[PDB]
């Protein structure tokens, strides 16, 4: 079973939040209302839009014990006509089931949860920015909430949904082998809470280390697999003298990106250069960047789109990259297409229109 | 700068709830009260022992977005005399501590915890079952509380403590272990040897899957050589007479992908004491397991952790191949003996620095 959309009940609030005024840090500004399905032994009930609320929670929820908790990420961006478009959301949607299938939490329907947050953004549709480079923030979350101390499936789960208004610059990062974010057989593939709770620690050892980002590296090879909450991209000269843009394939310790999967079939698309999903070494960067083989090193994901790179403190080794002095071409080329698909610029399947 | 348990604020409820009657599955009974204190820019608040209630949270909380969550698990015991004790809880809050660093959550006072985690349980000190193998469990939480979906170190946060009786966990019965290499509990330079919630979230579905293949717990291997790290949720030791024909007993070492239990810890600190026979901190694997196995120098198998002191293991699904343990054959004398000097130890039979009286 699932919870329907033609099931959802408003309550609009009676205390509208003042609206930002004329400086936006990410993810501390939320809109008015939120969306709220819960889960029990009874199945789905009914889906609300709410006004924005603290949650009431057991003490003993397994929610806050066990990290029974899953979250999604995605952008709704306003185009010149004030039209209101998300940005391939059945991938996030996608993603989101199996986080919560990972995780033994309740199924649920995509489209029909998909339809509950296009209700949710179209209540709070004068939240959403227009600003050149501005969006609006859309994290759903899906928890288990079973008063229980037993590490096992609970029988009680919430979903939630809220909004956050959100308002070129390289940056360096930490490339230290101690460090791991997942592994082989492991979770890191999917969007759960307890990926992110302990690189803290570590984003603090690399902003004291001067640099801006972790670069995780797994293995003994040193593989490139992502940086910060970003998937990592080279666009370079490869050793059999092919350009080629390469990124980390997905088996198993790289999250499945959405913007990634998109960098990847527009490039594809183009059919300019060769496009491949391979396993990126230090020593394959080291050589490449001896030899002037790498153009651009960049990441990708909802917070920035594509964001470059250029430093990268390998252990004590300062290893500078040239994105920016050849270009960044492709980059630009990704944020021109992005930014013309997101606005309503340009008609796309991509776009679901609010 | 920590809260402090001079400054504790004592709020009894109105109407209390009727203990159980001697039904018990666990976690799912707490007790009248629970103890919860503040943490933000102010730094820590005044603790306070209240009755148990809900938890109000933003929904943008860190707890709940990014996993800065991290419990304990630990025991208190009420003797004849009707006193209750606290099992060497000074190690978990020193685990707890460390867990705390790891997730960039506020710095404590260890021994003002304790001291409140003894009122709160001297408070509630009538739900501490004094029937055979039964006890209180205590579970202290200490979650971030940022409202916002920044992943970072957190200004607010809040630790509470809950507590649940618990019915005798048992008579020794043993468990049946599947072990699939495909499932990864935890990875050297991870945070497995820290009990994060993140920890055990994942391990839900495997558990599952043990049970499909006619198993009751997961046996975590590690390695491509196959290393026996942890039982379910419980530390692994092996009682064997070794390659070079010496008997001991072993558990793997804290590498980074074992949880130091307390249980593990004792289990050593007291077999050294008897000074009878070998104690190691070695690697085991699954090809050393199966030599001995074939060869009839395995006597005893078993998992050490809070929720069991010492649990028997008599067969493991590897390859779907089932392997049989003569743990059961061999007594258990070990498990046995073990599990008597901890009940001794726990129900103040025998006096011990290990005991901390409520
Ligand atoms: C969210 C996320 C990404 C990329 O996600 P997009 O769907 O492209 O926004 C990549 N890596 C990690 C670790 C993430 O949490
Ligand atoms: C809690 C725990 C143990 C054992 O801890 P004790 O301190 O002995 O109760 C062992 N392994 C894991 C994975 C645990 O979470
Ligand atoms: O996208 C994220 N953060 C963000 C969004 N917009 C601007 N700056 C930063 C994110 C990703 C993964 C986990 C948490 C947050
Ligand atoms: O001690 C635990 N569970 C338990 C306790 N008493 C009886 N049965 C089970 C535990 C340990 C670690 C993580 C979660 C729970
Ligand atoms: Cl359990
Ligand atoms: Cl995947
Ligand atoms: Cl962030
Ligand atoms: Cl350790």
Same mark, same amino acid.
């Given at each position: ?7 959802? /009940?408003?309550?609009? $609030? /009676? ?16 809109? +008015? ?6 889960? =029990? ?8 839009? !709410? ?20 979250? &999604? ?8 006509? !004030? ?8 991938? =996030? ?36 920015? +227009?600003?050149?480079? $501005? ?68 984003? /603090?050892?690399?902003?004291? *280390? ?58 594809? $698309? ?7 999903? *391979? $396993? ?10 001896? &030899? ?18 250029? *430093? ?5 080794? =300062? ?9 960044? &071409?492709?980059?630009?080329?990704? /944020?021109?297409?992005?930014? &013309?698909? !997101? ?12």
């Amino acid at each position: 079973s699932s919870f329907k959309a033609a099931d959802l /009940q408003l309550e609009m $609030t /009676q205390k509208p939040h003042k609206k930002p005024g004329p400086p936006l840090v990410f993810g501390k500004t939320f809109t +008015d209302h939120m969306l709220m399905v819960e889960w =029990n032994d009874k199945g789905w009930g009914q889906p609300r839009i !709410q006004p924005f609320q603290n949650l009431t929670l057991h003490p003993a929820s397994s929610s806050l014990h066990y990290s029974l908790q899953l979250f &999604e990420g995605m952008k709704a961006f306003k185009g010149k006509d !004030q039209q209101v478009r998300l940005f391939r959301p059945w991938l =996030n949607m996608d993603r989101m089931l199996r986080s919560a299938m990972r995780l033994c939490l309740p199924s649920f329907d995509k489209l029909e949860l998909l339809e509950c947050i296009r209700r949710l953004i179209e209540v709070d549709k004068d939240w959403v920015p +227009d600003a050149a480079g $501005t969006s609006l923030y859309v994290r759903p979350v899906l928890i288990g909430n079973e008063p229980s101390l037993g590490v096992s499936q609970p029988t009680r789960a919430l979903l939630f949904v809220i909004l956050c208004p959100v308002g070129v610059t390289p940056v360096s990062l930490l490339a230290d082998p101690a460090f791991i974010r997942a592994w082989v057989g492991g979770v890191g593939n999917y969007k759960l809470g307890g990926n992110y709770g302990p690189t803290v620690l570590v984003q /603090q050892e690399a902003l004291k *280390r001067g640099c801006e980002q972790v670069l995780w590296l797994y293995g003994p090879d040193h593989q490139l697999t992502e940086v910060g909450t970003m998937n990592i991209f080279v666009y370079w000269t490869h050793e059999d003298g092919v350009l080629e843009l390469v990124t980390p394939p997905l088996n198993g310790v790289i999250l499945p990106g959405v913007v990634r999967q998109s960098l990847l079939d527009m490039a594809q $698309t183009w059919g300019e250069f060769r496009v491949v999903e *391979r $396993t990126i070494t230090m020593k394959q960067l080291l050589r490449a960047l001896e &030899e002037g083989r790498v153009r651009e090193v960049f990441g990708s994901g909802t917070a920035c789109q594509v964001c470059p790179v250029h *430093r990268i403190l390998y252990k004590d080794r =300062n290893l500078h990259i040239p994105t920016m002095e050849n270009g960044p &071409e492709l980059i630009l080329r990704f /944020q021109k297409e992005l930014k &013309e698909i !997101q606005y309503g610029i340009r008609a796309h399947e991509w776009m679901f229109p609010v």
